[PDB]
Amino acid sequence: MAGALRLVLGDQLSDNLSALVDADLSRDQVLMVESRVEATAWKHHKQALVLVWSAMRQFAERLRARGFNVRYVTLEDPDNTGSIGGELRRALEARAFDRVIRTACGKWGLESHLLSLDLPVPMETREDDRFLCSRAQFAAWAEGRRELRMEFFYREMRRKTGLLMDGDQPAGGRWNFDAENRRKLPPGLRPPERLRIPPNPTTQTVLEQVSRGFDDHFGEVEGFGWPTNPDEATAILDHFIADMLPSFGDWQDAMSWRRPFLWHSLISPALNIGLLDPLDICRRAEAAWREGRAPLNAVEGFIRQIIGWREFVRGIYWLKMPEYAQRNALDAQGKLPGFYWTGQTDMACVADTVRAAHDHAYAHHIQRLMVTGNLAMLLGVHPDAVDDWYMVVFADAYEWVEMPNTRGMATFADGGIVGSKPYAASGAYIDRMSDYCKGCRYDVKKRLGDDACPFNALYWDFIDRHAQRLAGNGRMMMPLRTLEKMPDAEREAFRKQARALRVKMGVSG
Ligand SMILES: Cc1cc2nc3c(=O)[nH]c(=O)nc-3n(C[C@H](O)[C@H](O)[C@H](O)COP(=O)(O)OP(=O)(O)OC[C@H]3O[C@@H](n4cnc5c(N)ncnc54)[C@H](O)[C@@H]3O)c2cc1C
Ligand SMILES: Cc1nc2c(=O)[nH]c(=O)nc-2n(C[C@H](O)[C@H](O)[C@H](O)CO)c1C
Ligand code: SF4
Ligand SMILES: [Cl-]
Ligand SMILES: [Mg+2]
């Protein structure tokens, strides 16, 4: 009858967390740790550190106001062992407990370590039921499927959640209103100004501590504008729903120089730590369509990203780990170019993506996928180095979501499990979808020579290198038959260009 020690991690800041919902407030204690192991396993963006630790401190205060005894161990505490496991042991030695209760986390290596810890009391691990699909439900869906197609998973999630269902039929009589007709912004359309959250007093304190104590971590911390508690996160969501969602579908794949947010929701950093709930977000978007304040194609496209892609990538991560993290289907062995960290490249699209990561800890999906992701795949950068960049530079990065999007969708190192095909593209794609190329030093109409857009020769050398494997993929027919129709002299020409680019960029050779 000594009570339970209830662990809450930095991405578990939800009243409904499974480790909390049956607490005995008169006997139990919550443990929350600012852990330098977790902060440095990858050296996360300064803004990611500020976000998590500010949000953590405020959640602890919200728990105390509700009657919880909270043992909170800060980054400054001189007795903090630095690790979750060390701090569990320290808490169990400070007073009597009958058991530890925790919620399964979002990183296989940490989950595996915690499951193996030898503690003086039992540890009970509960599934994270903030997600809409359980790990077991995904495994059951996936069983027997030669290929995992997000669309079919998504339809099941629509039926299960009831989102955008009119009786037993999808709203509007189609499941998906996606189409491949998206374009860049018209020249006269200026993306709108976005709501930012000025740091509250707790956030300001953490910002000062991170600026002094983690100066070697990537990124700028001045200008921090992310929400750090439920009120701030709800303000950001309200702004998206009212002001941005009606145009969300039109501009979902566009890119505009030094306009990093466009009409995206900017909620992933808050949702991924628990400050928003995925079902609530989707119900709010559905209500906007049902009340006549947004079109169905925009609302369906937004919901598909949360109950479709987000749940799907989590499902594949837990289905396939730990071997997933060792897959390298294309035998990529190159080094990551230094300009991924410094931004010092004349490729305007790449430079702008690195700039947004540095200044905001954010870039939207198409930029992550088709600029820096595609480039790394075409260069043949080793997947560990690519994962290590995406885990550092964005404030929504956790392995369960980063890895299937990066090792899977963006670079095909998983051989197509997540994405079915490589999302390889030349500069022509970036030119069509962005305003980058007019002002770029390089010429997107050229493949060879010092003025040619590097993506153009790298794209064709990638298709060439992997032509047989992509033939046995079936989803690359338009490019492979273009390749086969080029004369040997044309193919040799772009092979030499791509080889020279990989040496110049510090990748290999
Ligand atoms: C290489 C690469 C790495 C990525 N790494 C991460 C990561 O570490 N963390 C992360 O949360 N997302 C990651 N994504 C997915 C996606 O790019 C981000 O979720 C999105 O950019 C967040 O911006 P937003 O909140 O403005 O989203 P919106 O464009 O407004 O989309 C709405 C919501 O849908 C979800 N979402 C959309 N696309 C995806 C997706 N492919 N996978 C999962 N959720 C999705 C998010 O919850 C997002 O908030 C990655 C994508 C790629 C291509
Ligand atoms: C930056 C950071 N800091 C902490 C921390 O101080 N304490 C903690 O308990 N968790 C932290 N996390 C989250 C974990 O590193 C990890 O990514 C998630 O628990 C994965 O589910 C992160 C990401
Ligand atoms: S020309 Fe090539 S490198 Fe320059 S912005 Fe366009 S796609 Fe990017
Ligand atoms: Cl993680
Ligand atoms: Mg000590």
Numbering used by the authors: 1 to 509
Original authors' sentences:
Photolyases repair UV damage to DNA by using absorbed blue light. Within the photolyase/cryptochrome superfamily (PCSf), a major subgroup consists of prokaryotic (6–4) photolyases. These enzymes rely on flavin adenine dinucleotide (FAD) as a catalytic cofactor, besides an ancillary antenna chromophore, and a [4Fe-4S] cluster with yet unknown function. For the prokaryotic 6–4 photolyase of Caulobacter crescentus, we investigated structural changes associated with its different redox states by damage-free crystallography using X-ray free-electron lasers.
The side chain of K48 is almost halfway located between the DLZ antenna in the N-terminal domain and the FAD’s isoalloxazine. Although the displacement of the K48 side chain may be dictated by the changed electrostatics around the isoalloxazine moiety and Wat1 movement, this residue participates in the stabilization of DLZ binding. A K48A mutation results in a partial loss of the DLZ antenna, which can be observed through UV/vis spectroscopy. This is further supported by the structure of the K48A mutant, where the DLZ antenna appears to be only partially occupied. In the 1.5 Å structure of the K48A, we find only an occupancy of ∼50% for the antenna.
